[PDB]
Amino acid sequence: WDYDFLQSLGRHEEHVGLAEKLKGEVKSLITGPMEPLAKLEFIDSVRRLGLKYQFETEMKEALANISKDGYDSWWVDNLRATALRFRLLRENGIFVPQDVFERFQNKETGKFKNELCEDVKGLLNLYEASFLGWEGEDILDEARTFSTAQLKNVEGKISSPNLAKIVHHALDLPLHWRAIRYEARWFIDIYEDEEDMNPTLLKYAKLDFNIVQSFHQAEIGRLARWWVGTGLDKLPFARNGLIQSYMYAIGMLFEPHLGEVREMEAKVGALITTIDDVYDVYGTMEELELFTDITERWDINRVDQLPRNIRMPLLTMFNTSNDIGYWALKERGFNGIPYTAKVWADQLKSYTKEAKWFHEGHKPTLEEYLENALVSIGFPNLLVTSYLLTVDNPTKEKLDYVDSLPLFVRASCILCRIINDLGTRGDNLKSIQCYMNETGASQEVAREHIEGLVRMWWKRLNKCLFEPSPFTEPFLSFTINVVRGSHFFYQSWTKNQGMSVLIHPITL
Ligand SMILES: CCCCCN(C)CCC(O)(P(=O)(O)O)P(=O)(O)O
Ligand SMILES: [Mg+2]
Ligand SMILES: [Mg+2]
Numbered sequence: 392w393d394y395d396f397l398q399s400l401g402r403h404e405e406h407v408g409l410a411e412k413l414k415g416e417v418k419s420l421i422t423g424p425m426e427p428l429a430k431l432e433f434i435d436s437v438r439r440l441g442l443k444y445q446f447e448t449e450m451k452e453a454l455a456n457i458s459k460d461g462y463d464s465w466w467v468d469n470l471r472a473t474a475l476r477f478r479l480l481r482e483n484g485i486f487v488p489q490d491v492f493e494r495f496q497n498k499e500t501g502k503f504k505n506e507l508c509e510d511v512k513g514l515l516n517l518y519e520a521s522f523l524g525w526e527g528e529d530i531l532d533e534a535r536t537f538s539t540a541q542l543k544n545v546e547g548k549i550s551s552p553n554l555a556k557i558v559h560h561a562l563d564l565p566l567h568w569r570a571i572r573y574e575a576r577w578f579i580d581i582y583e584d585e586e587d588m589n590p591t592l593l594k595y596a597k598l599d600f601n602i603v604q605s606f607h608q609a610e611i612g613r614l615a616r617w618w619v620g621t622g623l624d625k626l627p628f629a630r631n632g633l634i635q636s637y638m639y640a641i642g643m644l645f646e647p648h649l650g651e652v653r654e655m656e657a658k659v660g661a662l663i664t665t666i667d668d669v670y671d672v673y674g675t676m677e678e679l680e681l682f683t684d685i686t687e688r689w690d691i692n693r694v695d696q697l698p699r700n701i702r703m704p705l706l707t708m709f710n711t712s713n714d715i716g717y718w719a720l721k722e723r724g725f726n727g728i729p730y731t732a733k734v735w736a737d738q739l740k741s742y743t744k745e746a747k748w749f750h751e752g753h754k755p756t757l758e759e760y761l762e763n764a765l766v767s768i769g770f771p772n773l774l775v776t777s778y779l780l781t782v783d784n785p786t787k788e789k790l791d792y793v794d795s796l797p798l799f800v801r802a803s804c805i806l807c808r809i810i811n812d813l814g815t816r817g818d819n820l821k822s823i824q825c826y827m828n829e830t831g832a833s834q835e836v837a838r839e840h841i842e843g844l845v846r847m848w849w850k851r852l853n854k855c856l857f858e859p860s861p862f863t864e865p866f867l868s869f870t871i872n873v874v875r876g877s878h879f880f881y882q883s884w885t886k887n888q889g890m891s892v893l894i895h896p897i898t899l
């Protein structure tokens with residue numbers, strides 16, 4: 392990554408009329424007659440190509456009327472149709488019971504019938520649908536285990552390279568857990584080779600992708616300029632994480648109309664990865680204690696006591712925090728500086744508890760560690776910032792409620808932390824080793840336990856999305872998509888993902 396070259400991008404196309412024509416056509420298709428299984432497959436194709444943000448209402452209405460049609464003959468007895476309907480309806484907020492899978496099980500033992508290994512597409516759809524489940528839905532747990540076992544069994548026996556690629560991709564990460572934009576870039580190429588491929592939808596996908604990528608490149612140019620202006624790229628003992636943070640933010644939100652929010656999120660992310668290193672890599676406890684005190688008091692009057700290599704990240708945090716709070720004051724009429732200050736103070740207190748534990752040789756339980764680490768991962772900061780920047784009529788009360796980390800937000804933060812600990816030269820007190828110290832458990836027993844925690848908290852997020860809350864569409868999607876971006880990173884192979892998504896356009 393030549394940041395010299397990324398300041399280039401965004402400085403330097405009219406396909407927008409054809410884009411609007413293709414959008415009207417795809418929209419008519421979504422409203423079109425569409426025998427119901429074909430309509431489901433089309434809606435799911437539109438989603439996988441990253442186009443749901445264009446056709447929100449049409450997709451919702453189409454799925455709502457599919458749910459309310461008078462007859463079930465078109466999907467019952469059909470595993471692919473049953474699973475796809477389950478998943479899409481339950482993604483749309485329309486509950487479907489797990490009972491619909493019982494007719495594919497041996498009615499005595501509850502096991503899915505081994506003969507289903509003859510239906511690869513149905514197995515894939517059952518697999519994908521299983522990750523829409525909640526706690527206590529045992530049929531969906533069984534569906535996950537069975538489908539994964541069978542798919543890995545037959546992956547070597549599949550001779551269609553396209554379907555082998557799809558099966559391998561699903562085994563890497565289920566669709567429910569995948570970052571939308573990167574998955575869209577992958578599935579454009581995949582969809583171009585599918586059986587019932589619709590060329591109108593494919594062309595619109597490619598064109599819309601290039602346009603959104605143009606917005607992204609302008610954003611990257613501005614952010615690289617700012618980041619060089621901070622001088623933080625030239626820190627020897629701190630990660631140069633501007634482009635990594637922007638990739639995180641793309642996973643969190645990719646819509647062009649949210650661009651400015653992205654930039655701020657990106658900024659915060661960068662600073663997070665810098666300050667963490669200040670706390671994890673190169674910093675005296677006296678230096679970090681002073682860092683934390685200054686941040687808690689929001690008072691930079693004694694900042695010159697710090698060496699300039701620490702003084703620059705601290706003051707960049709300070710000034711960017713004030714800038715974002717003032718953006719809130721100006722554009723939303725609400726001074727957000729106290730809340731950016733609060734979230735940074737809380738995150739530095741979490742960093743401080745972690746560093747103090749290390750120096751003390753403390754070995755916390757997994758629960759204690761996680762209580763601190765859902766904050767130290769930084770996503771309370773990022774999510775409260777996104778809420779500040781996007782909520783209608785911001786108030787002290789709304790901000791206090793979101794910053795209290797209710798179950799929905801707290802589950803997303805926990806997931807980000809434990810996913811990063813599964814993906815992880817620093818502080819070796821992470822999730823796995825905390826559990827090992829707790830229970831004396833094995834390396835791999837602890838790892839599988841943490842993976843089970845991943846599944847459990849995803850179940851809780853799924854059930855949260857069905858339950859009333861004072862949160863609305865954009866923040867909802869933010870909360871899910873930070874977990875998806877975490878899955879994206881801690882599965883450089885991430886570098887070439889950035890090249891394919893943010894740098895190179897799609898040839899048309
Ligand atoms: C974009 C904001 C999240 C990016 C990841 N941050 C660096 C978190 C820091 C960590 O996760 P990292 O593993 O050091 O990257 P930590 O485990 O030290 O808390
Ligand atoms: Mg770290
Ligand atoms: Mg750390």
Ligand SMILES: [Mg+2]
Nearest residue numbers: 671815817818
């Ligand atoms: Mg770490």
